[PDB]
Design a protein around this ligand. Structure first.
Ligand SMILES: Nc1nc2cc(CCCCCc3ccccc3)ccc2c(=O)n1C[C@H]1CCCO1
Length: 329
């Protein structure tokens, strides 16, 4: 559509990378979409780390539209340590170019080994301002404040298959991408993209679950107890001292992850939550399920769910829309 469709690149069918440019010189940098992360993050030429030098780095001097807030920003996530200073400049994504406030990082040691190995140089913030630092408005909302898109909405088309090419339609919805019905579900809150659905894995039940879709997450989460009670003699090998699990690729005991709600029902099947780990041992597949508990009932619909279901997000509707992703081609 005349809307901005940012192609998503396929990587080991485990993550998608989206190209983008920042600065007046439109310096190119690889950024992965993140339904959660907000304030955009940018690698900086001022970064003295070894992992920074092997990837693209932004330059503040080669931008006539650059601005220096100077306010320091230290992001030290768990097993991590990051630091950058506020910097506003022209952020060019596809056919749209809006001045946005980004965090110019100079320290990336706490994730330096993980970044050096990874082909991304930054991240993408596509969440509600509630999760944004320095009270920074959402990119897609600011594109609708400007005469650049007519709707504050963004859709995802993960390039699961090698031939399948990813796309991020921003400003409208293309029926071509999603085949069959498109159902919307209310948001339990407006801080970040999240909904309330009733999880049912066969006889195992957990209603009123805060299903949250994350493009960054590369697996489907689940409460710790739910992961165990459901996996009782299902021939699912477990990895000790390692948060991973293996299992037969053809086993009939492998359930389907289904979420029921008043507006419609969703179902993720084995071919979606299984990984072809036959590389180490033929015929062996890994469950892309990472169990984790939170302060209130919560589930995570990461790449797996988004890969099968074309996702839709609308700040104006205060809802997440879901529909079957069109078969490759
Ligand atoms: N995805 C995701 N990313 C996260 C990222 C962080 C740290 C990011 C700091 C910037 C790192 C960086 C950027 C650019 C270049 C080098 C380094 C912390 C928590 C989450 C975190 O919780 N999540 C999960 C969901 C839920 C809410 C957010 O997204």
């Amino acid at each position: 559509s005349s809307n901005d469709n940012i192609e998503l690149v396929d990587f080991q069918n485990i993550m998608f990378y989206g190209d983008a440019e920042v600065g007046d010189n439109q310096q190119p940098f690889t950024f992965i979409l993140d339904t959660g992360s907000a304030n955009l993050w940018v690698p900086s030429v001022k970064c003295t780390t070894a992992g920074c030098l092997t990837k693209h780095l932004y330059d503040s001097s080669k931008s006539r539209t650059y601005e220096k807030d100077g306010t320091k920003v230290e992001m030290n996530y768990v097993s991590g340590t990051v630091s950058g200073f506020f910097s506003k400049d022209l952020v060019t994504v596809g056919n749209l170019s809006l001045p946005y406030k980004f965090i110019e990082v100079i320290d990336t040691n706490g994730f330096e080994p993980t970044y050096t190995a990874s082909t991304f140089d930054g991240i993408l913030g596509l969440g509600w301002k509630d999760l944004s630092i320095g009270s920074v408005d959402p990119i897609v909302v600011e594109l609708k404040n400007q005469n650049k898109i007519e709707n504050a909405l963004f859709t995802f088309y993960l390039p699961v298959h090698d031939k399948h090419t990813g796309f991020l339609t921003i400003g409208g919805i293309e029926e071509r991408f999603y085949e069959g019905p498109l159902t919307y579900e209310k948001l339990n809150h407006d801080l970040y993209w999240q909904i309330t659905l009733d999880a049912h894995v066969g006889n195992i039940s957990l209603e009123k679950a805060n299903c949250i879709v994350d493009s960054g997450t590369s697996a489907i989460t689940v409460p710790t107890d739910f992961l165990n009670k459901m996996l009782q003699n299902l021939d699912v090998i477990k990895v000790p001292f390692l948060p991973f699990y293996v299992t037969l690729c053809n086993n009939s005991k492998l359930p389907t992850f289904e979420f029921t709600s008043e507006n419609g029902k969703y179902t993720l099947e084995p071919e979606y939550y299984l990984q072809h780990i036959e590389d180490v041992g033929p015929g062996l597949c890994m469950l892309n399920i990472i169990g984790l508990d939170f302060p209130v009932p919560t589930f995570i619909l990461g790449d797996p769910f988004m890969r099968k279901y074309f996702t839709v997000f609308d700040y104006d509707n205060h809802s997440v829309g879901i529909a079957l992703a069109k078969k490759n081609l």
